[PDB]
Every structure is written in C-alpha cells, then in structure tokens.
C-alpha cells in the first residue's frame, strides 16, 4: 500500500479527484426508490381530462 | 407484501361484528412459513 503525496502546487492530472459511482439494480422487490411525480394546478366545474 | 389489519375496541371472546381496517403497507419481499409470539413475563 503506497501513499498519494497530494500537494497544492501539483499539475492537473496529479491533483486529487473525488469520485462517486452509482449502480442501479432491480432484484425481485416490487417497489423501491424512484423519482418525483410532478403535479399541476386543479380546476373545477369544467369537463376535463 | 405483508399486510396487517387491526382494530382496538374496548369491551372467552364475546359475540359481535367489527370490520378491521388496513394498518400498514410493507414492500418487504419476505417469505413466511412459520412464526412465534412474544410475551411480557413476571419478574418483580
Ligand atoms: C418463497 O418460496 C417459494 C418456494 O416455496 C419460492 O419459489 C419463492 O421465490 C419465494 N419467494 C421469495 C420472495 O423469495
């Protein structure tokens, strides 16, 4: 296990980078995380769909 | 889905009718074939 010696006067491509990899999977459970459902206003006394 | 209905009504069981309403909705996925119960003992 060697170490990174990060100093501020380095060159881009030697400076530290924070990485976040995401991974989605749907095994067998018939509900879980999913994004937001948007809802608009609401009118009354009108034939509407 | 593991559903639970319940109701708490104040008063061998008596005789009457009372419909039970949904309590939870639990998207677990769990299989069940057996179960047990838990009781509060007397120690003091
Ligand atoms: C529950 O058990 C059955 C076999 O009795 C199996 O086929 C099924 O996949 C199991 N369900 C879950 C959610 O693991």
Give the residue whose CA is nearest to atom 8 of ligand 1.
B31
| Distance separating alpha carbons of residues B7 and B24, to the nearest angstrom | 12
Q: Residue B20 contacts by C-beta under 8 Å, 6 or more apart in sequence?
A: B5, B6, B7
Atom of ligand 1 nearest to the CA of A28: 13
Q: Given CB atoms, is B27 within the 8 Å cutoff of chain A?
A: yes
Q: Which two tokens stand for residue A5?
A: 């010696």
| Distance separating alpha carbons of residues B17 and B14, to the nearest angstrom | 10
Say if residues B5 and B31 touch (Cβ distance below 8 Å).
Answer: no
| Distance separating alpha carbons of residues A15 and A5, to the nearest angstrom | 10
Experimental method: cryo-EM
CB contacts, 8 Å: A25 with chain B: none
What pairs with residue B5 in β-bridges? B22
Distances (CA, A) of B22 to A16, A17, A47, B2, B19: 53, 50, 34, 11, 10
| Distance separating alpha carbons of residues A12 and A19, to the nearest angstrom | 16
For residue B29, the tally of other CB atoms under 10 A from its CB is 13
Q: What is the resolution of this structure in A?
A: 2.8
Burial of residue B43 (number of CB atoms within 10 Å: 0-12, 13-18, 19+)? exposed
Query: Angle CA(B16)–CA(B17)–CA(B22) in degrees, nearest 5?
Result: 140
Q: Which two tokens stand for residue A1?
A: 């296990």
User: Inter-chain contact B29–A32, Cβ cutoff 8 Å?
Assistant: no
């Amino acid at each position: 296990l060697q170490s990174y010696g990060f100093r501020p006067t380095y060159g881009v491509g030697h400076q530290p980078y924070r990485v976040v990899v995401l991974s989605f999977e749907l095994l067998h459970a018939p509900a879980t995380v999913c994004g937001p459902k948007k809802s608009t206003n609401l009118v009354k006394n009108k034939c509407v769909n | 889905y593991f559903k639970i209905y319940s109701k708490h009504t104040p008063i061998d069981l008596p005789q009457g009718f009372s419909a039970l309403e949904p309590l939870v909705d639990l998207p677990i996925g769990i299989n069940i074939t057996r179960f047990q119960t838990l009781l509060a003992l007397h120690r003091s």
